[PDB]
Amino acid sequence: NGDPSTLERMSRAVEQAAPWLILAGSGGIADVLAALVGQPHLLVPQVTE
Amino acid sequence: LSTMEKRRRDSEEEVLRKTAHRVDLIAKYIGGLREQEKRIKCLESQANY
Numbered sequence: 001n002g003d004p005s006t007l008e009r010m011s012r013a014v015e016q017a018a019p020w021l022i023l024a025g026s027g028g029i030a031d032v033l034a035a036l037v038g039q040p041h042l043l044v045p046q047v048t049e
Numbered sequence: 050l051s052t053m054e055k056r057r058r059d060s061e062e063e064v065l066r067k068t069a070h071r072v073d074l075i076a077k078y079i080g081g082l083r084e085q086e087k088r089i090k091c092l093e094s095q096a097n098y
Contacts, residue, residue, distance in 0.1 A: 038091075039095045046098070047097070047098060
């Protein structure tokens with residue numbers, strides 16, 4: 001359940017090819033990211049909102 | 050002979066064997082059904098909005 005800023009940080013980690021692990025019920029960012037990455041949609045700014 | 054057979058067919062270990070076989074069949078069947086269920090559920094939930 002990191003801050004929204006952590007998202008950008010995690011972005012920086014993706015290019016570094018570092019294995020990531022998330023917890024479903026830890027908190028908000030984690031729980032939402034669980035679903036978000038589940039279904040790939042090109043543009044979902046309203047869904048993400 | 051019929052009595053010997055009846056006593057054998059009601060032997061405790063034989064009951065366990067029969068139950069194990071039926072449970073295996075139920076497990077395979079229910080597992081297939083469950084596997085189909087989540088696959089359908091993801092496709093149905095993706096169309097959320």
